[PDB]
Write a protein that binds this ligand. Sequence first.
Ligand code: FES
Ligand SMILES: [K+]
Ligand SMILES: [K+]
Ligand SMILES: [K+]
Ligand SMILES: [K+]
Ligand SMILES: [K+]
Ligand SMILES: [K+]
Ligand SMILES: [Mg+2]
Ligand SMILES: [Mg+2]
Ligand SMILES: [Mg+2]
Ligand SMILES: [Mg+2]
Ligand SMILES: [Mg+2]
Ligand SMILES: [Mg+2]
Ligand SMILES: [Mg+2]
Ligand SMILES: [Mg+2]
Ligand SMILES: [Mg+2]
Ligand SMILES: [Mg+2]
Ligand SMILES: [Mg+2]
Ligand SMILES: [Mg+2]
Ligand SMILES: [Mg+2]
Ligand SMILES: [Mg+2]
Ligand SMILES: [Mg+2]
Ligand SMILES: [Mg+2]
Ligand SMILES: [Mg+2]
Ligand SMILES: [Mg+2]
Ligand SMILES: [Mg+2]
Lengths: 170, 65, 108, 70, 113
Amino acid sequence: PMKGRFPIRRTLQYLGRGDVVFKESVKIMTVNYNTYGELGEGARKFVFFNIPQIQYKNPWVQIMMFKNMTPSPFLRFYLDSGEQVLVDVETKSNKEIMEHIKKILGKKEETLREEELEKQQRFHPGNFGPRKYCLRECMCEVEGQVPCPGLVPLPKEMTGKYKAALKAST
Amino acid sequence: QTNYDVFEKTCKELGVEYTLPPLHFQKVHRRFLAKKALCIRVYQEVQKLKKQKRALKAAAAAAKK
Amino acid sequence: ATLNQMHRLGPRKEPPKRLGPTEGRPQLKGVVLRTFIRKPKKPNSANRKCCRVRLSTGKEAVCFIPGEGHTLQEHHVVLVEGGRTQDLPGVKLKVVRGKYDCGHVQKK
Amino acid sequence: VLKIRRRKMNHHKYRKLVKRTRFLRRKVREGRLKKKQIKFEKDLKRIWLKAGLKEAPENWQTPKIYLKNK
Amino acid sequence: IVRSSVHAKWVVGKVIGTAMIKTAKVRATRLVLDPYLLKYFNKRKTYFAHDALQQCSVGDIVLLRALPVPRSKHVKHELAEIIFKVGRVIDPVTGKPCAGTAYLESPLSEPRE
RNA sequence: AAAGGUUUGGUCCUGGCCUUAUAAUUAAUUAGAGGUAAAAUUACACAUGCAAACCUCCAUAGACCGGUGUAAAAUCCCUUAAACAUUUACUUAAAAUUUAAGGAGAGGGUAUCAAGCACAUUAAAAUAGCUUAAGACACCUUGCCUAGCCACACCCCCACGGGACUCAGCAGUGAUAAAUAUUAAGCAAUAAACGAAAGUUUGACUAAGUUAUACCUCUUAGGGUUGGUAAAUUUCGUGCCAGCCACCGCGGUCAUACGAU
RNA sequence: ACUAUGCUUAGCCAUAAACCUAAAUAAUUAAAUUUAACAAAACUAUUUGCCAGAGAACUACUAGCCAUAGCUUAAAACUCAAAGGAC
Ligand code: FES
Ligand SMILES: [K+]
Ligand SMILES: [K+]
Ligand SMILES: [K+]
Ligand SMILES: [K+]
Ligand SMILES: [K+]
Ligand SMILES: [K+]
Ligand SMILES: [Mg+2]
Ligand SMILES: [Mg+2]
Ligand SMILES: [Mg+2]
Ligand SMILES: [Mg+2]
Ligand SMILES: [Mg+2]
Ligand SMILES: [Mg+2]
Ligand SMILES: [Mg+2]
Ligand SMILES: [Mg+2]
Ligand SMILES: [Mg+2]
Ligand SMILES: [Mg+2]
Ligand SMILES: [Mg+2]
Ligand SMILES: [Mg+2]
Ligand SMILES: [Mg+2]
Ligand SMILES: [Mg+2]
Ligand SMILES: [Mg+2]
Ligand SMILES: [Mg+2]
Ligand SMILES: [Mg+2]
Ligand SMILES: [Mg+2]
Ligand SMILES: [Mg+2]
């Protein structure tokens, strides 16, 4: 049995389910929540369930959380321009909080798809090389091309050993 | 951490001095306290010599000017 | 241990693998110094043929000579290998029959 | 059962061994403390010499902390 | 008006010391993923920040701005803002003084003092 | 791990060791040829040959390729800036290649290494601070980040100087080690250098030689084992001796366990 | 028979099978839980400390300590295929 409560939170599949990918402006996200109360239940659940997913997709954003410092829970984002975006998450479900921050400061699906394609621009299927980078190491692997001498012996006339012998004979 | 204004009045009226918790715990024993005393003394002597040198160097420059 | 304690400690600390009589080498060459008999610990009862040797490393070790009959003498050269003699305590080396001066057991 | 008996028997043989060599151990200790003091003094001399001082700070005398001062 | 090279253009932390002149020692914390456990823990870093007015006190949350040129070996940030003052917090949502999870001044009232 | 053997009078629990799988090196025994891949005891000392030229003089190159793993927790990733011993365009802009200063995060061991001793800030030059059990400091060990990278180039970290005065280029030799490739051919291909060029040079490289170390294709058959784990023994000899075992064990006269068969 | 000692006044030493051989805290009693057995019915969560075969070893060395035949901290070589627990 995996230790802790809700051990599914400690699986790569769960961490990858997060959909909030912040815009490049977002630099810090402070989370102010209360450990006791009734109107802050969604905030507590957001710290428990959602903060790991947000950090996983936004490794360079500083997430710092403060407890029981104010009467109500809120989120404050610090942007690179110097703007500060305050969000009030009282009486809001954890799912509601995620959708709100996704709308205001989350990259759209179109933008993310473009980045993925651009990342793979330099991979070409025709390129030959090691398995880590390429599909085929050598043209001998291709069908119809001359096979590797190691697997299949070459004709004698295609061998330097044989060609050298004829030149001596000449 | 909660009401600094009340905290200040309470300490002043009750006459209680509050010292903040020290970030790092310091071990204490005869060997440490004796080395730590010399290290402070050695530093002070080195700095005192530098101050004297600066005054003499500046004094010589002033005379030339 | 708790997840916080497992994090502060990390993976288990692993004692290093200390070497044996051959010092992590397949074989060693040594010069015989003496040939003697060792008595196996009870319940075993025999007169096991062993020899002391000076290995190339510079240390001296006791090596069991396997087989029925050996012609080894002082100043001979042999190739020792690993493998402990279970009944003989302290004998952690064995001589290779058929290499250098030591020869294959003489089937007679 | 035999584990406390062995601690007892092992502990019994150590107390006997300490008794036989009690005087030797005393001279070992007095010499280990003297080396412990010289190591302390030398370590203090290294500090001021590295800092650039040619003599120890004025009015400083390395305290003798391992001697029979108490 | 080129910006700093350092990655931490904006860092939030707690003022853990203020014994240097015009400088506040600040402890920031970031979340780092433990690869074996796949759980996030707090990695803390110390940042020296230029406090020109010596307006910082131990325990207050502050925002630091990366200086364009490092002032010294360790002072590469300045005090941009004091997010929360120690014991003198002002609720961002309502704007009323608070002392923990309570309002020193009710949000219904309008003291304007 | 789909497990197994092994504590006992017996059962159960706990717990270590070992077996079964896979690979590299060396050794014993044994072995036909062919194709391919790889080649490796040693930063110990080196006989001899060769490894950098080109070219109408100036220059350019010999800073590369090739080699080794010396030193160092040495690094990775990322940011900023500026260059190059460069290239190609413009007489000013795109690259390749580096250098310097840095830091989101990650980065070997010992805590019986627990304190370091100037390791800080301010900028009238004062303040007394800086790192550290969230592991400082000290010591020890190791090439890592692997289309490749980093460090080293007889030794003194460096190399003015000095010394014990150069193969860690190819081949080869001495010593050492369990460890054993040719003192070989060609610049025809590709790469590099040079030249405006036809071209020249290259122990890079290419085609060969050597070696069951691996793979593939074939043809001879040899090697080990046979109490249990764990597939498989007949007769005879030996008699706690001679010997055997990875673990449990076997051998004192009916030994499936040793030796021959 | 008699002394140190047990007592008082001042210090020191810091050791016990210092043991309820049960860390603390908040739960739940059903999850078709004798989940080994025996103790003391079982079990979830939280935080810290600690453990990683036995012997060597309440040991050697190290550092600290009013402790000087002392306490706390605490290995390796080497040996064995077990040691150990409950019935
Ligand atoms: S691997 Fe392609 S010719 Fe051999
Ligand atoms: K026997
Ligand atoms: K077992
Ligand atoms: K047992
Ligand atoms: K060097
Ligand atoms: K050529
Ligand atoms: K046989
Ligand atoms: Mg061989
Ligand atoms: Mg190279
Ligand atoms: Mg080295
Ligand atoms: Mg020690
Ligand atoms: Mg040399
Ligand atoms: Mg040099
Ligand atoms: Mg050579
Ligand atoms: Mg040379
Ligand atoms: Mg070889
Ligand atoms: Mg040209
Ligand atoms: Mg018989
Ligand atoms: Mg057998
Ligand atoms: Mg037989
Ligand atoms: Mg009396
Ligand atoms: Mg009791
Ligand atoms: Mg004791
Ligand atoms: Mg002791
Ligand atoms: Mg001791
Ligand atoms: Mg041990």
